[PDB]
Amino acid sequence: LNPKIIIFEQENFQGHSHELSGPCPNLKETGMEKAGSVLVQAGPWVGYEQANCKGEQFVFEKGEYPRWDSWTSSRRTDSLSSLRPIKVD
Amino acid sequence: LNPKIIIFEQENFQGHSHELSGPCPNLKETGMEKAGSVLVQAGPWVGYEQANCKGEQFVFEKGEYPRWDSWTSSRRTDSLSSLRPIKVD
Protein backbone atom coordinates (compact mmCIF):
# COMPACT_ATOMS: atom_id res chain seq x y z
CA LEU A 1 0.00 0.00 0.00
CA ASN A 2 1.92 3.05 1.27
CA PRO A 3 5.30 1.80 2.62
CA LYS A 4 6.96 4.55 4.67
CA ILE A 5 10.30 4.35 6.43
CA ILE A 6 12.52 6.97 8.14
CA ILE A 7 16.22 6.75 9.04
CA PHE A 8 17.77 9.01 11.70
CA GLU A 9 21.54 9.50 11.75
CA GLN A 10 21.86 9.13 15.53
CA GLU A 11 20.32 6.68 17.98
CA ASN A 12 17.10 7.53 19.79
CA PHE A 13 15.79 9.33 16.71
CA GLN A 14 18.20 12.26 16.93
CA GLY A 15 19.89 14.16 14.12
CA HIS A 16 19.06 14.54 10.44
CA SER A 17 16.37 12.22 9.07
CA HIS A 18 15.85 10.51 5.70
CA GLU A 19 12.45 9.27 4.52
CA LEU A 20 11.77 6.54 1.94
CA SER A 21 8.61 5.17 0.34
CA GLY A 22 10.27 2.77 -2.05
CA PRO A 23 13.53 0.85 -2.77
CA CYS A 24 16.88 2.61 -2.30
CA PRO A 25 20.04 0.83 -3.59
CA ASN A 26 22.44 3.20 -1.80
CA LEU A 27 21.38 5.13 1.31
CA LYS A 28 24.34 7.46 0.86
CA GLU A 29 22.36 9.14 -1.94
CA THR A 30 20.02 10.55 0.69
CA GLY A 31 22.93 12.27 2.40
CA MET A 32 22.77 9.81 5.29
CA GLU A 33 26.14 9.66 7.05
CA LYS A 34 25.16 6.60 9.07
CA ALA A 35 22.07 4.79 10.36
CA GLY A 36 21.53 5.60 14.05
CA SER A 37 17.90 4.59 14.52
CA VAL A 38 14.88 3.68 12.41
CA LEU A 39 11.19 4.56 12.49
CA VAL A 40 8.85 2.39 10.42
CA GLN A 41 5.48 4.03 9.75
CA ALA A 42 4.38 1.45 7.19
CA GLY A 43 6.23 -1.75 6.29
CA PRO A 44 7.65 -4.32 6.40
CA TRP A 45 11.03 -3.45 4.92
CA VAL A 46 14.28 -5.34 4.54
CA GLY A 47 17.56 -3.50 5.04
CA TYR A 48 20.99 -4.58 3.83
CA GLU A 49 24.48 -4.12 5.24
CA GLN A 50 25.85 -3.18 1.80
CA ALA A 51 24.59 -1.18 -1.18
CA ASN A 52 22.36 -2.79 -3.82
CA CYS A 53 20.83 -5.37 -1.46
CA LYS A 54 24.03 -7.18 -0.51
CA GLY A 55 25.44 -8.57 2.71
CA GLU A 56 23.54 -9.18 5.94
CA GLN A 57 19.75 -8.70 5.87
CA PHE A 58 17.66 -6.97 8.56
CA VAL A 59 13.87 -7.00 8.89
CA PHE A 60 12.08 -3.73 9.69
CA GLU A 61 8.50 -4.10 10.82
CA LYS A 62 6.11 -1.32 11.79
CA GLY A 63 7.43 0.23 14.99
CA GLU A 64 10.60 1.78 16.40
CA TYR A 65 14.29 0.78 16.34
CA PRO A 66 16.16 3.31 18.58
CA ARG A 67 19.57 1.69 18.28
CA TRP A 68 21.46 -0.55 15.83
CA ASP A 69 21.24 -3.54 18.17
CA SER A 70 17.47 -3.13 17.94
CA TRP A 71 17.48 -4.33 14.33
CA THR A 72 20.32 -6.83 14.48
CA SER A 73 21.14 -9.63 16.88
CA SER A 74 24.04 -11.15 14.91
CA ARG A 75 26.40 -8.72 16.63
CA ARG A 76 28.15 -8.06 13.30
CA THR A 77 27.65 -4.44 12.25
CA ASP A 78 25.43 -1.33 12.40
CA SER A 79 26.00 -0.75 8.69
CA LEU A 80 22.81 -0.10 6.68
CA SER A 81 23.32 0.79 3.00
CA SER A 82 20.18 -0.22 1.12
CA LEU A 83 16.47 -0.68 1.84
CA ARG A 84 13.36 -1.93 0.01
CA PRO A 85 9.73 -2.66 0.92
CA ILE A 86 9.16 -6.40 1.36
CA LYS A 87 6.84 -8.08 -1.16
CA VAL A 88 3.64 -8.92 0.72
CA ASP A 89 1.69 -12.18 0.31
CA LEU B 1 -3.75 -14.15 6.95
CA ASN B 2 -2.33 -17.62 6.22
CA PRO B 3 1.49 -17.93 6.04
CA LYS B 4 2.82 -21.18 4.63
CA ILE B 5 6.43 -22.18 4.09
CA ILE B 6 8.12 -25.49 3.36
CA ILE B 7 11.71 -26.47 4.08
CA PHE B 8 13.28 -29.32 2.11
CA GLU B 9 16.12 -31.44 3.48
CA GLN B 10 17.94 -30.89 0.18
CA GLU B 11 18.21 -28.39 -2.66
CA ASN B 12 15.87 -28.28 -5.64
CA PHE B 13 13.06 -29.28 -3.29
CA GLN B 14 14.26 -32.87 -2.84
CA GLY B 15 14.20 -35.01 0.28
CA HIS B 16 12.02 -34.67 3.37
CA SER B 17 9.90 -31.54 3.72
CA HIS B 18 8.74 -29.64 6.79
CA GLU B 19 5.77 -27.28 6.62
CA LEU B 20 5.22 -24.26 8.87
CA SER B 21 2.37 -21.75 9.23
CA GLY B 22 3.63 -19.98 12.32
CA PRO B 23 6.73 -19.22 14.43
CA CYS B 24 9.15 -22.09 15.06
CA PRO B 25 11.99 -21.39 17.55
CA ASN B 26 13.91 -24.56 16.65
CA LEU B 27 13.69 -26.25 13.25
CA LYS B 28 15.26 -29.46 14.58
CA GLU B 29 11.94 -29.99 16.38
CA THR B 30 10.40 -30.66 12.96
CA GLY B 31 13.03 -33.33 12.36
CA MET B 32 14.82 -31.11 9.86
CA GLU B 33 18.50 -32.08 9.74
CA LYS B 34 19.41 -29.33 7.28
CA ALA B 35 17.75 -26.68 5.12
CA GLY B 36 18.55 -27.71 1.55
CA SER B 37 15.93 -25.56 -0.16
CA VAL B 38 12.90 -23.40 0.63
CA LEU B 39 9.45 -22.95 -0.89
CA VAL B 40 7.24 -20.05 0.19
CA GLN B 41 3.52 -20.52 -0.55
CA ALA B 42 2.38 -17.48 1.40
CA GLY B 43 4.85 -15.07 3.01
CA PRO B 44 6.94 -13.20 3.73
CA TRP B 45 9.02 -15.04 6.34
CA VAL B 46 12.29 -14.35 8.09
CA GLY B 47 14.73 -17.14 8.95
CA TYR B 48 17.53 -16.92 11.53
CA GLU B 49 20.93 -18.59 11.79
CA GLN B 50 20.43 -19.40 15.47
CA ALA B 51 17.54 -20.88 17.42
CA ASN B 52 14.83 -18.73 18.98
CA CYS B 53 14.89 -16.18 16.16
CA LYS B 54 18.37 -14.96 17.06
CA GLY B 55 21.35 -14.22 14.84
CA GLU B 56 21.67 -13.40 11.16
CA GLN B 57 18.37 -12.90 9.32
CA PHE B 58 17.31 -14.13 5.88
CA VAL B 59 14.15 -12.87 4.19
CA PHE B 60 11.99 -15.38 2.34
CA GLU B 61 9.27 -14.05 0.07
CA LYS B 62 6.60 -15.90 -1.93
CA GLY B 63 8.46 -17.94 -4.51
CA GLU B 64 11.15 -20.60 -4.71
CA TYR B 65 14.62 -20.84 -3.16
CA PRO B 66 16.28 -23.88 -4.86
CA ARG B 67 19.64 -23.62 -3.09
CA TRP B 68 21.53 -22.23 -0.09
CA ASP B 69 22.75 -19.34 -2.24
CA SER B 70 19.28 -18.04 -3.07
CA TRP B 71 18.52 -16.44 0.31
CA THR B 72 22.00 -15.73 1.65
CA SER B 73 23.87 -14.20 -1.28
CA SER B 74 27.01 -15.04 0.70
CA ARG B 75 28.58 -18.40 1.53
CA ARG B 76 28.75 -17.32 5.17
CA THR B 77 26.82 -20.32 6.44
CA ASP B 78 24.02 -22.70 5.46
CA SER B 79 22.54 -23.02 8.94
CA LEU B 80 18.89 -22.15 9.42
CA SER B 81 17.63 -22.73 12.96
CA SER B 82 14.43 -20.71 13.37
CA LEU B 83 11.72 -19.10 11.23
CA ARG B 84 8.70 -16.86 11.68
CA PRO B 85 6.19 -14.99 9.53
CA ILE B 86 7.04 -11.31 9.12
CA LYS B 87 4.48 -8.89 10.53
CA VAL B 88 2.43 -7.15 7.85
CA ASP B 89 1.10 -3.56 7.76
PDB file of C-alpha atoms in Angstrom, chain A residues 4 7-8 10 15 20 33 36 38 42 57-58 60 62 66 74 77 80 84 86-87:
ATOM      1  CA  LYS A   4       6.961   4.546   4.672  1.00  0.00           C
ATOM      2  CA  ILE A   7      16.217   6.748   9.038  1.00  0.00           C
ATOM      3  CA  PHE A   8      17.768   9.008  11.699  1.00  0.00           C
ATOM      4  CA  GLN A  10      21.864   9.134  15.534  1.00  0.00           C
ATOM      5  CA  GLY A  15      19.894  14.163  14.124  1.00  0.00           C
ATOM      6  CA  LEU A  20      11.772   6.537   1.941  1.00  0.00           C
ATOM      7  CA  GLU A  33      26.141   9.656   7.055  1.00  0.00           C
ATOM      8  CA  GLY A  36      21.531   5.597  14.047  1.00  0.00           C
ATOM      9  CA  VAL A  38      14.883   3.682  12.413  1.00  0.00           C
ATOM     10  CA  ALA A  42       4.381   1.446   7.195  1.00  0.00           C
ATOM     11  CA  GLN A  57      19.748  -8.696   5.872  1.00  0.00           C
ATOM     12  CA  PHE A  58      17.662  -6.972   8.557  1.00  0.00           C
ATOM     13  CA  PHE A  60      12.078  -3.730   9.690  1.00  0.00           C
ATOM     14  CA  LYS A  62       6.106  -1.317  11.787  1.00  0.00           C
ATOM     15  CA  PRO A  66      16.156   3.312  18.580  1.00  0.00           C
ATOM     16  CA  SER A  74      24.043 -11.146  14.912  1.00  0.00           C
ATOM     17  CA  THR A  77      27.646  -4.437  12.252  1.00  0.00           C
ATOM     18  CA  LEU A  80      22.811  -0.101   6.683  1.00  0.00           C
ATOM     19  CA  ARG A  84      13.360  -1.925   0.012  1.00  0.00           C
ATOM     20  CA  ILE A  86       9.159  -6.398   1.363  1.00  0.00           C
ATOM     21  CA  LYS A  87       6.843  -8.080  -1.165  1.00  0.00           C
TER      22      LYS A  87
END
